[PDB]
Design a protein around this ligand. Structure first.
Ligand SMILES: CO[C@@H]1O[C@H](CO)[C@@H](O[C@@H]2O[C@H](CO)[C@@H](S[C@@H]3O[C@H](CO)[C@@H](O[C@@H]4O[C@H](CO)[C@@H](O)[C@H](O)[C@H]4O)[C@H](O)[C@H]3O)[C@H](O)[C@H]2O)[C@H](O)[C@H]1O
Ligand SMILES: *[C@@H]1O[C@H](CO)[C@@H](O)[C@H](O)[C@H]1NC(C)=O
Ligand code: NA
Ligand code: NA
Length: 362
């Protein structure tokens, strides 16, 4: 399929994030400068996540409905949707306890198939709304590096099967799909990049190379630069120390195995470089980060369809409350901002950090 799905469309800024900013953040921010900036960030079009089954029949439909409405009223160019599919059973297999709602051992496969089927039903009813999907962040990447972790080892075949199922069922003509493929600091290491290309290329193949699968999404919910002149200290000794280096190394390996993947790159929290991460693998609520380059299809790069905002900045990565059931070690470190609420919940102090550190500024 020849055609960048981000080209020739405007990207819809969804009302779920807008409401978060306007109802939870702006009333809380006294400083004029920041409050102007906040209102402006609310209009930056970030991905909306289907992180729970209940979102399918409510939020997904609401957003597609609003987009259709805006387009029917004369939006020019028309608006497109950006949605994340994020509800594999045994989700986030490397964590002690995931916020995911389903389990492989408790009818997780069937629940997920129905989930996908219902999404498909809805997408088919909104065939007039160009729809871009990011498929399952924090899933197949674990298969490259975390097979020594029992929940991951045990989830691998199901991850693969359900991913293929999704790629095939959501291969509709008005859709473009990007599978998550970690980031420079995860799969970009020379010991990992080849096995990663293998994995993803093979999935593409077994899925029948569906037209709709455009490629891969990188840096989702992470902080890496697209392109910086010198390597952040915590990146050494990796030559792929930013997404540009990663993707330039990654694409040829994918292509040689039959998957000429185009990429989208999350920059929603990449504005400040280097970050305040003490080590690169410090992924949770990292300090010293800022909103990054605004979403655009004009990337200047042949292999990159668009710079995007996948993880919506200000939505938490995980809780720092050691007394809490889904507490995660990484969220309690010295370079994680604290105290932090549950994953996905609004973390206003983190929002303010991102606003202060925005590059380009608001
Ligand atoms: C070897 O390199 C390192 O590998 C480790 C793994 O061994 C990598 O760690 C993993 O990094 C991921 C970030 O790159 C996070 S993803 C995490 O969970 C989800 C998915 O992104 C996000 O939470 C949700 O966000 C949604 C949108 O706000 C909500 O809708 C939803 O409710 C939330 O659940 C969260 O923000 C992300 O931070 C893994 O948790 C981590 O194990 C490491 O990156 C490599 O360097
Ligand atoms: C998922 O949501 C649908 C409505 O979209 C509901 O019919 C279904 O029962 C939900 N799944 C589970 C396992 O509860
Ligand atoms: Na409306
Ligand atoms: Na391999």
């Amino acid at each position: 399929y020849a055609g960048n799905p981000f080209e020739g469309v405007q990207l819809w800024a969804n009302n779920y994030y807008r409401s978060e900013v306007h109802t939870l953040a702006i009333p809380q921010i006294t400083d004029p400068a920041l409050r102007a900036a906040a209102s402006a960030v609310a209009e930056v079009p970030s991905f909306q996540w289907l992180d729970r089954n209940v979102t399918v029949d409510t939020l997904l439909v609401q957003t597609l409905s609003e987009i259709r409405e805006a387009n029917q009223a004369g939006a020019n160019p028309q608006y497109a949707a950006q949605i994340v599919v994020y509800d594999l059973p045994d989700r986030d297999c490397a964590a002690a306890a995931s916020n995911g709602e389903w389990a492989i051992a408790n009818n997780g496969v069937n629940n997920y198939k129905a989930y996908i089927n219902r999404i498909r039903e809805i997408l088919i009813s909104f065939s007039d709304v160009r729809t871009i999907l990011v498929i399952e962040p924090d899933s197949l990447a674990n298969m490259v590096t975390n097979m020594n972790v029992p929940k991951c080892s045990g989830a691998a075949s199901t991850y693969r099967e359900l991913t293929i199922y999704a790629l095939k069922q959501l291969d509709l003509p008005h859709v473009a799909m990007y599978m998550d493929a970690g980031h420079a600091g995860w799969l970009g290491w020379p010991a990992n990049i080849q096995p990663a290309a293998e994995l993803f290329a093979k999935i593409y193949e077994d899925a029948g190379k569906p037209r709709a699968v455009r490629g891969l999404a990188t840096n989702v919910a992470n902080y890496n630069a697209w392109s910086v002149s010198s390597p952040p200290p915590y990146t050494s000794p990796n030559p792929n120390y930013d997404e540009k280096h990663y993707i330039e190394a990654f694409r040829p390996l994918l292509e040689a195995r039959g998957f000429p993947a185009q990429f989208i790159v999350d920059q929603g929290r990449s504005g400040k470089q280097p970050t305040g991460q003490k080590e690169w693998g410090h992924w949770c609520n990292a300090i010293g980060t800022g909103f990054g380059m605004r979403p655009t299809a004009n990337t200047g790069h042949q292999y990159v369809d668009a710079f995007v905002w996948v993880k919506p900045g200000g939505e938490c990565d995980g809780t720092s409350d050691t007394t809490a059931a889904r507490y995660a070690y990484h969220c309690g470190l010295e370079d994680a901002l604290k105290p932090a609420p549950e994953a996905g919940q609004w973390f206003n102090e983190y929002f303010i950090q991102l606003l202060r550190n925005a590059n380009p500024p608001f």
